[PDB]
Amino acid sequence: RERVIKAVNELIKFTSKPEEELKKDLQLIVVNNKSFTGTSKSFKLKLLNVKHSFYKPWKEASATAVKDFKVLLILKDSDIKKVSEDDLFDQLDSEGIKVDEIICGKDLKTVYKAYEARNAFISQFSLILADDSIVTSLPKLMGGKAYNKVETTPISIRTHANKEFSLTTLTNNIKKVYMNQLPVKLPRGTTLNVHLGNLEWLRPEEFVDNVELISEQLIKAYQIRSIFIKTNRSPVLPLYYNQDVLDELEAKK
Amino acid sequence: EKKERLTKEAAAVAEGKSKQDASPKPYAVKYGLNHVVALIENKKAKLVLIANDVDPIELVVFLPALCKKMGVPYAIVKGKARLGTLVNQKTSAVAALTEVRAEDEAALAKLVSTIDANFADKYDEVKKHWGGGILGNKAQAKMDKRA
Amino acid sequence: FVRAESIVAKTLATSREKERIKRVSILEDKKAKNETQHIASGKDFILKITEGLIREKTTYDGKPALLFIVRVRGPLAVNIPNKAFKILSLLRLVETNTGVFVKLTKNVYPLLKVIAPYVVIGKPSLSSIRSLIQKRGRIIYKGENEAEPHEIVLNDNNIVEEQLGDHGIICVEDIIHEIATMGESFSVCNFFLQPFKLNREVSGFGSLNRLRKIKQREAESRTRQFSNAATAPVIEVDIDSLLAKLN
Amino acid sequence: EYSGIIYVSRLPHGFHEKELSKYFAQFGDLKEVRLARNKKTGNSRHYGFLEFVNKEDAMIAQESMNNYLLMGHLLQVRVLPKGAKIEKLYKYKKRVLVEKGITKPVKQLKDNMKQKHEERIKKLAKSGI
RNA sequence: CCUUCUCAAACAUUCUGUUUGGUAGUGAGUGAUACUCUUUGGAGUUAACUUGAAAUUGCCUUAAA
C-alpha cells in the first residue's frame, strides 16, 4: 500500500508536466497470468466489488462535458407493457439517478437496424443494462462494434425473480450495480486492463483502499503474477511479481 | 377501421382524455391530383409516382416538368389500376409518399437512389427523339426487298 | 429462370438451420459425455399448448409414452440438412401429409429435438388410434402369385393370424392393444403397419379455398413457433383434435 | 477494347462464389469465379470477378444487372478493358488457434524476469520518474 | 426479397436475498503505448476515432399453373 500510494502520487506527477485532453489522463491497471481460456472467447462481464463506486461521481463529472452521460435499459419484449417510466422516475431519484431509455428488443430489429442508425443510437449512451434473458441474444441485435468497447457492452441484471417481473427486483439490483459494482471483461491471452477512471474524478485517498480490495479479490481467481499501473502514456510500473505462480508451467504438461 | 377508431375516440374524448390526440399520428399515401400538385410547390412530397396511361393524357403531361423544376423524385409507373390498388379506388392517376415511419427511412432512401440511377440517368435521350415513325409489315417488307 | 433472390434466401435459411442443428447436437453430446460443468441448462422440458393460447412447461422424467408424428413442410426456404434427412428417412417420413407411430422414451429426446421444425407431435386418445387403424393403414402380402412389390388394404384378420401367430397376435384389435399399451416390444408391429398416408386439410385454389388457406396459415403462424434456441422444449398440440380434420 | 472479365461489387451477405456462379452461368458458360474474403475468420469483402468466354456476355450481364437491386444493397458491375487478368483473392478459412509452446525450461525465463524488474526500473528512471 | 439462442438449477425467506452457468460479429481504413509465449515463425491481448451495409485483385412441391 506504500507502493500503491507512491505509484499513484508519481503518476499524478507524470500528468502534472507543463478529445486528447480528457484522453491523456485515464488511469488503467494491467494484470496478467499464466494463460487464459484456450480457443474460446468470453462475452460476460464480471462486476467486481468496491467500497467507493466510480460510477456515482461520473454523473456530475460527465454532466458538464460533451460525452453526455446517459443510460439504457433493455427489458424483455413483454415488460414494456408493465414497467412505465414515471415509476422509475419516482423510485430512482430518491436514490440519485434515473434510467432514461427503455428500448424493447423489437426496436433492435425494426428501427435500429441499418448500422449507421445503430451506431448513431449507440454512441449516445454510457451506462447500458440488459435483461438477463436477452443478453444471450444481444450479439446478434447490436453487433461486435458495441462489444469493441468496455462501457457499451450490455450488462446483465437479474430482472426475473421467483417469481414474475416484480420491478422491485429491478430496483433492488440497479442500485447494487450502479454504486456497489465495477465491470470488467476477461479476454484470451494474459493481459487485462481495467479503467479505474480519470484523475479529474474520485481521489487517491479512496483509490488506495479500492485497489486493495480489487487486488484481494482478483489475485485469487486466475493465478495472476503481474500487476502494473499506467495512465494512457506512462511506462509500466512494477507493483507485483509472484514467481510462485510460474511453477505450474512445468507441472501442467 | 375508420368506424373503429371513431368508436375508440368516442369513448376516450370524455372518459379518459382525447382532443383527437389519443390515437397516434397516421401515415398514409396522398393520391389526389389537385392535392399532389399542391403538395409539390410546398415542398413536402418525397417521391411521386405517375401513372403512364391516362386517357386524357394532358392531365399528367405536365407533371414531370414541374417535378424536375421543383426538385422532386418523380417516377412513371406502368398502370393506373395498379396505383389504385394501394389507395382503394379503381384508378388513381398519381400517388405520393410525403412522410414515412421510422423503420422505413433506409428503405425510402435506397429506393429514391435506385430511381435516380435507373430513371433519371437511363433516359437522357427522352427529351429529344420524336417517337413513332414505324412502318407496317407489308410496307416494311416492300422497302426491305427494294433496298 | 432462377432469379438470384431465391438462391440467396435458400443459402441464408440453410446456414441458419445448419448452425442451429450444430448447436443442439454439440450441446446434447456434451450433456451425454457428463463432463457437465461448462453447460447451459440442467434438465429438459416439454411445452403443451391448448387454445390467444394457453401454454405449460414441464420436465419429461420418462416414463415412456406413445407418440404420434405427422410430417409437415417448411419453413419456406430450408434446404433440409443431412442429419435431419437421415432421421426422417429412418422414420420413413419422406413425402409430407403422412403419419407414423413412435415409442417415446428417454433416448429419443435427442432425436425429436433435432427434427422439431419439420413434424408435429402429439399424444392422442384411444379413439384416434382405433379409428386410424380401421380407416387407414396397409399391409404387404404374398401368396400364389404377386412377387410382392405391392401393398393391399387390411380387410382380413387371418393375414395377421399368419404373419404374427408366433406372438399370438390375431385380429388387429390385438395390435391396437399392443400399440396403446406399449406391449410386446411394439417394434415388429410398427414395422408391419406400413406408416400411414393422411389427406391434406385444404385442397383448393378456387375462391373460397384461398380464404381457408389464408386462415390456416395465419393460425399456424400464431401457434406453431420455431425457436432456434438450442435449448427449446418440444411442443405438444391437440392431435386428438388435429386428426378430426386430417382423417 | 474490353475484356471478357466482369467485376461485381456491393454484393449482399450470404451471396458467395457458389451462388454467384450458379446465377451468372444463366448468361452462358463461365470460365472462373473469384470472390474477395478475409485472411482471419474469412468473411465476404463484398466484391469479386468473373469471366465467361465471349466479349458480349459481359455487356449483356452489365446492361442487365448494373443497377439491379436485390436485398437492400443495389448491385454494381463493370466490364474490364483488354486484360487486367484477375490474379488474387484465394479462398480462406477461419483461423483456429493452436498454442505454440511451452518448450523452454522456466529457469532462463525466471532469470529473464529477475532482470526485467530492474530493466523496467531503469526505463522509468530515464523517462524519468 | 429468409428473418435474429428473448431462462437453468441450487441454497434460502426479508413479500427477492445470494452462488453458478449460458453470448464468436458488416467490411474497410485511421491510430497511442504496454505486455505473454516462441524462435525469428510473429502469434494472444491492449487507451479510441471515421463511414448513405460504403467496396478493384493483402500470399419437402395442392407455397400450382
SS (H, E, C) D30-95: CCEEEEEECCCCCCEEEEEEEECCCCCHHHHHHHHHCCCEECCEECEEEEEECCCCCCCCCCCCCC
Identity of the residue numbered D35: L
| B47-51: strand order across its sheet | B74-77, B47-51, B95-97
- Number of neighbouring beta carbons within 10 Å of residue B55: 7
DSSP letter at B92 equals: -
Please say whether the dihedral angle defined by the alpha carbons of residues B125, B130, B136 and B140, taken in this order, is positive or negative: negative
- Helix A204-218 to helix A2-15 angle (10° resolution) is 130
| A170, B50, B94, B106, C140 from B44: Cα distances, Å | 45, 17, 15, 18, 74
Distance CA C222, CA C216 (A): 10
Distance CA D123, CA D127 (A): 6
| Cα–Cα nearest to C134, from C184, C186, C180, C173 | C173
Within 8 A by CB and 6+ apart from C4, the residues are: D15, D19, D23, D70
CB C49 within 8 A of CB C55: yes
Q: Is any atom of nucleic acid chain E found less than 7 Å from the CB of residue C153?
A: no
Cis peptide before C75 (omega within 30 of 0): yes
Judged by C1' against the alpha carbon of C85, the nearest nucleotide is E60
- Checking A198-203 for CB contacts under 8 A at 24+ apart, the result is A198/A22, A198/A25, A198/A26, A198/A27, A198/A61, A199/A11, A199/A12, A199/A15, A199/A25, A199/A27, A199/A231, A200/A22, A200/A25, A200/A61, A201/A54, A201/A57, A201/A58, A201/A61, A202/A52, A202/A54, A202/A57
Residue C222, classified by CB atoms within 10 Å of its CB into exposed (0-12), middle (13-18) or buried (19+), is exposed
Distance CA D8, CA D62 (A): 9
Distance CA B31, CA B92 (A): 7
Distance CA D59, CA D74 (A): 18
Distance CA B94, CA D7 (A): 39
DSSP letter at A47 equals: E
- Looking at the structure of chain C, the number of domains it has is 1
Angle formed at CA C90 by CA C86 and CA C91, multiple of 5 degrees? 120
Q: What are the grid coordinates assigned to C127, written together?
A: 379413439
DSSP-derived 3-state class of residue A210: helix
DSSP-derived 3-state class of residue A37: coil
Residue A181, classified by CB atoms within 10 Å of its CB into exposed (0-12), middle (13-18) or buried (19+), is middle
Distance CA C69, CA D115 (A): 72
Q: Is any atom of nucleic acid chain E found less than 7 Å from the CB of residue A217?
A: no
Q: Where are the beta strands (DSSP E) in chain A?
A: 26-33, 46-49, 71-74, 101-102, 127-131, 155-157, 181-184, 192-198, 224-230
Q: Name the residue range of residue C21's domain.
A: 1-247
Q: How many CB pairs under 8 A join A and D?
A: 34
Q: Is any atom of nucleic acid chain E found less than 7 Å from the CB of residue C211?
A: no
Q: Is any atom of nucleic acid chain E found less than 7 Å from the CB of residue C7?
A: no
DSSP per residue, C190-243 = HHHS----PPPS----SSSHHHHHHHHHHHHHHH------SSPPEEE--HHHHH
Chain C, residues 13-32, CB within 8 A of chain D, namely: 15
Distance CA C131, CA D43 (A): 55
DSSP-derived 3-state class of residue A188: coil
Q: What are the grid coordinates assigned to C57, written together?
A: 412447461
DSSP-derived 3-state class of residue C188: helix
C91-120 exposure pattern, b = at least 16 Cβ within 10 A, e = fewer: bebeeeeebbbbebeeeebbbbbbbbbbbb
Q: What are the grid coordinates assigned to A45, written together?
A: 462481464
Determination technique for this PDB entry? cryo-EM
- D67 vs B106, B107, B117: nearest CB: B117
DSSP-derived 3-state class of residue C45: strand
| Cα–Cα nearest to C200, from C215, C211, C216 | C216
Distance CA A132, CA C200 (A): 43
Within 8 A by CB and 6+ apart from A24, the residues are: A15, A231, A232, A233
| C27, D35, D55 from D48: Cα distances, Å | 37, 4, 18
Go through chain A and tell me how many residues it has.
253
| A73, A162, B29, B73, C154 from A157: Cα distances, Å | 10, 15, 43, 48, 62
Within 8 A by CB and 6+ apart from A241, the residues are: A225, A226, D113, D117
Nucleotides of E under 7 A from a protein CB: 1-9, 11-12, 15-18, 21-28, 32-39, 41, 43-48, 50-64
List, in sequence order, the alpha helices (H) in A34-166. Answer: 55-63, 85-93, 107-110, 115-122, 138-142, 144-147
CB A199 within 8 A of CB A12: yes
Cis peptide before A219 (omega within 30 of 0): no
Region for C61 from its dihedrals, namely left if φ exceeds 0, alpha if ψ lies in -120 to 50, beta otherwise: left
Q: What are the grid coordinates assigned to A41, written together?
A: 472467447
Identity of the residue numbered C207: S
CB C104 within 8 A of CB C61: no
Distance CA C137, CA C191 (A): 12
Q: What are the grid coordinates assigned to D69, written together?
A: 437491386
DSSP-derived 3-state class of residue C111: helix
CB C89 within 8 A of CB C63: no
Residue owning grid cell 458458360: D29
DSSP-derived 3-state class of residue C99: strand
- Enumerate the β-bridge partners of residue A157: A131
Within 8 A by CB and 6+ apart from C57, the residues are: C45, C46, C47, C233
Specify the resolution in Å. 3.2
CB A42 within 8 A of CB A187: yes
Distance CA C237, CA C223 (A): 9
Q: What are the grid coordinates assigned to D28, written together?
A: 452462358
Within 8 A by CB and 6+ apart from A21, the residues are: none
Please check whether residue D102 touches A, CB under 8 A.
Answer: yes
User: How far does the CA of D43 sit from the C1' of E43, in Å?
Assistant: 21
Strands C45-50, C234-236: pairing kind = parallel
Within 8 A by CB and 6+ apart from A96, the residues are: A56, A59
Q: Return the CA Rg of chain D.
A: 26
CB A98 within 8 A of CB A153: no
- Enumerate the β-bridge partners of residue B75: B49
CB C104 within 8 A of CB C64: yes
DSSP letter at C167 equals: G
CATH of segment(s) B1-136: 3.30.1330.30
HSE at residue D114, side-chain half, CA atoms within 13 A, is 8
- Enumerate the β-bridge partners of residue C234: C46
Residue owning grid cell 446478434: A140
- Number of neighbouring beta carbons within 10 Å of residue D92: 13
